[PDB]
Amino acid sequence: KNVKSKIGSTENLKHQPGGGKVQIVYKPVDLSKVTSKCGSLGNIHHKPGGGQVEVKSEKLDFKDRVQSKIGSLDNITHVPGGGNKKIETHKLTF
């Protein structure tokens, strides 16, 4: 069991604001094969090129305003537990 409650609250929540989440996996596999039997070869030049990976974030401008106004919280009964009995809240004004 999982219970979450909010009454009259204010939240500002951000995950990785500026640059975000970046995940890069670089795993090329090379299985080239040169074979010779009973013959003649010249020179071998094995010169394969590597990859380029680039991730960039240049000129970001992020601006937030959060405002909350409540006149009054009063006379609240909040029972997220179980098996309770005879819970009371009273208010009187003259």
Residue numbers in the entry: 254 to 274, 306 to 378
What does the paper say about this structure?
Mutation ∆K281 (previously called ∆K280) in exon 10 of MAPT reduces exon 10 inclusion by abolishing a splicing enhancer element, resulting in the relative overproduction of wild-type 3R Tau. We used cryo-EM to image Tau filaments that were extracted from temporal and frontal cortex of two cases with ∆K281 mutation. Filament structures were determined to a resolution of 2.6 Å, which was sufficient for atomic modelling. The core of Tau filaments from cases with the ∆K281 mutation comprised the 21 C-terminal amino acids of R1, the whole of R3 and R4, as well as 10 amino acids after R4, but lacked residues V275-S305 of R2. The extended and two-layered filament core is identical to the Pick fold, comprising 9 β-strands. Protofilaments extended from residues K254 to F378 of 3R Tau. Identical filament folds were present in grey matter of temporal cortex from case 1 and grey and white matter of frontal cortex from case 2. NPFs consisting of a single protofilament predominated. Unlike in other diseases with abundant Tau inclusions, TMEM106B filaments were not observed. We now show that mutation ∆K281 in MAPT causes an inherited form of Pick’s disease, indicating that relative overproduction of 3R Tau is sufficient to give rise to the Pick fold.
